[PDB]
Write an enzyme that holds these catalytic residues in place. Sequence first.
Site, PDB file in Angstrom:
ATOM      1  N   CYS A 130     -24.688 -12.580 -33.801  1.00  0.00           N
ATOM      2  CA  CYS A 130     -23.889 -13.489 -33.021  1.00  0.00           C
ATOM      3  C   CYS A 130     -23.624 -13.026 -31.624  1.00  0.00           C
ATOM      4  O   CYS A 130     -22.955 -11.933 -31.704  1.00  0.00           O
ATOM      5  CB  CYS A 130     -22.963 -14.198 -33.677  1.00  0.00           C
ATOM      6  SG  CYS A 130     -23.361 -14.872 -35.522  1.00  0.00           S
ATOM      7  N   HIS A 160     -15.936 -17.779 -32.722  1.00  0.00           N
ATOM      8  CA  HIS A 160     -15.735 -17.409 -34.401  1.00  0.00           C
ATOM      9  C   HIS A 160     -15.449 -15.816 -34.590  1.00  0.00           C
ATOM     10  O   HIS A 160     -15.514 -15.520 -35.718  1.00  0.00           O
ATOM     11  CB  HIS A 160     -16.630 -18.255 -35.133  1.00  0.00           C
ATOM     12  CG  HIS A 160     -18.235 -17.450 -34.900  1.00  0.00           C
ATOM     13  ND1 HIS A 160     -18.418 -16.262 -35.461  1.00  0.00           N
ATOM     14  CD2 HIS A 160     -19.133 -18.101 -34.478  1.00  0.00           C
ATOM     15  CE1 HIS A 160     -19.891 -15.992 -35.308  1.00  0.00           C
ATOM     16  NE2 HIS A 160     -20.334 -17.257 -34.530  1.00  0.00           N
ATOM     17  N   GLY A 172     -24.568 -10.230 -38.043  1.00  0.00           N
ATOM     18  CA  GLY A 172     -24.340  -9.589 -36.909  1.00  0.00           C
ATOM     19  C   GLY A 172     -24.886  -9.733 -35.533  1.00  0.00           C
ATOM     20  O   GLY A 172     -24.574  -8.807 -34.643  1.00  0.00           O
TER      21      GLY A 172
END
Lengths: 306, 306
Positions: free
Chosen positions: B145, B41, B143
Amino acid sequence: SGFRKMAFPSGKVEGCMVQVTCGTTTLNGLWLDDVVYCPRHVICTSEDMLNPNYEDLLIRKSNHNFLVQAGNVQLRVIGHSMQNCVLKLKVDTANPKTPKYKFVRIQPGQTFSVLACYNGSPSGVYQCAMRPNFTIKGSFLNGSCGSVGFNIDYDCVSFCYMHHMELPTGVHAGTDLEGNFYGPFVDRQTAQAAGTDTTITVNVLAWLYAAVINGDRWFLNRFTTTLNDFNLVAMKYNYEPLTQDHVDILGPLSAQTGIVVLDMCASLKELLQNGMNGRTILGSALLEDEFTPFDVVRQCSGVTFQ
Amino acid sequence: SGFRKMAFPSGKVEGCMVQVTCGTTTLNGLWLDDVVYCPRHVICTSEDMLNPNYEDLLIRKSNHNFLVQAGNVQLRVIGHSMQNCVLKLKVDTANPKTPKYKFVRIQPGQTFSVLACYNGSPSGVYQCAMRPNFTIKGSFLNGSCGSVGFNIDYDCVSFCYMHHMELPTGVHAGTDLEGNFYGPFVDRQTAQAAGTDTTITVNVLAWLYAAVINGDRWFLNRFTTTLNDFNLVAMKYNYEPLTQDHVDILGPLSAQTGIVVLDMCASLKELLQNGMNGRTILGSALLEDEFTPFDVVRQCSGVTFQ
């Protein structure tokens, strides 16, 4: 979101840990530039630790009695010296992995990360706090002496602690990296009284702010208090007295959450007097005091290093 | 002595973390040999995350839309591909700091360390457990991920987790490094029901063994129980059913402490039925379930790595 007891990335410190062997004693040393730092009782045997004359024990040694191991690298020892309770072994090779560093004497209530090591090999990493009575509640099995505590500010490692001793009560004592013990302890195997340990009040309050930030809502009441009135409840439950300096430490957290510091003090007073009724706060059934207000701001803002 | 929630030394993994930027989205990637792994993503915008056609979104990209940052090193991207929910970016330079590694799909109740990262820079290190409902209770700000969970066995890093998602309930979901989510979750911003989470019974029992090893004595009673009778109390309090396999897992801890596993089960039954009366166990007022029996043996024996 979420809140964890989080330790610093230990990569910078892993590259400094070595193995120091003197006679039949093996502990950990710290290799910064061309100097290795380690506890001075590496020169003691089991019998010596009850009443050791560290000076007299050191004359019996020369540079070639210290065998320093960095993985499989052999460090030649070209000089040794005692500074308080630590040994400084001059080696002929500067550590190529030396980060920028400081030596810092921390204050009680501050937190740091501990890289537990055995025979010079890193085992684990965890955070703890310098208790008000200058002990630490860590995990230090036999052979962990010389393991260091540290903080990281972007690119610089601030060494503040090196482990020396397990008290007969099960708590842990050690020095700064100038060799000065925190508290009244001495590198000797004897009865050592640890003073009364109070709870770090400013840390509990900052941890209460992190709970409000992360959704734990239930413990904020409709009461307020004064500094002297909360301090009355403080000594009842063996909490540190709150000063105006502690209030200003919590300033930024008061600004974001919109809860006045003294209102948070009233919530703490009710938690101490009424217990917790079986509920939890950030997965904890006690009041946590190992988070400094600077620790809370870091986790709640995403501050990184390097 | 002493027992801490201790994480692995994160030095091996720090040298693999990079920054992956696609359009206006920035998260973390993992650089192993000449391949960078990161959540898929990264190719989504905020609007896309509600119903993203990941295939269709990927055709709109080519190799030069992925900007990979390792500190200040520029990695050229020479190929990209989707494997389930992760992106594999072929880079023209193998990571010189690549350790020996495995990709492992862990089972519920297992533990691993998490290196929380932001923009490719390590922030902190903490241990957690794969909850029985396949979520994790970590700390993942915006932030984070692409941050990875891992275990270390001497010299080999076993990557088991990479963070993807914060559920609207505040818990965290992610994948293995083959891109398969743990549990029923999907990289989409929608309502995602998390199943009932039970307590990891074998982990609580192993943590009770670590307490006896370290002096916490008070909760061992004069009762015993059977497997089916304890399992009756288990579902009452939403504890995992104990199997003979769990009993054998605890075999070594039963041997050292001399307390039969079923006798420890009787102590747990009394703790669940009677509460804790305000006492603590290894500094905790709840029953801890984030320590596997292998975690307890490690800390209580001084097992190191590298």
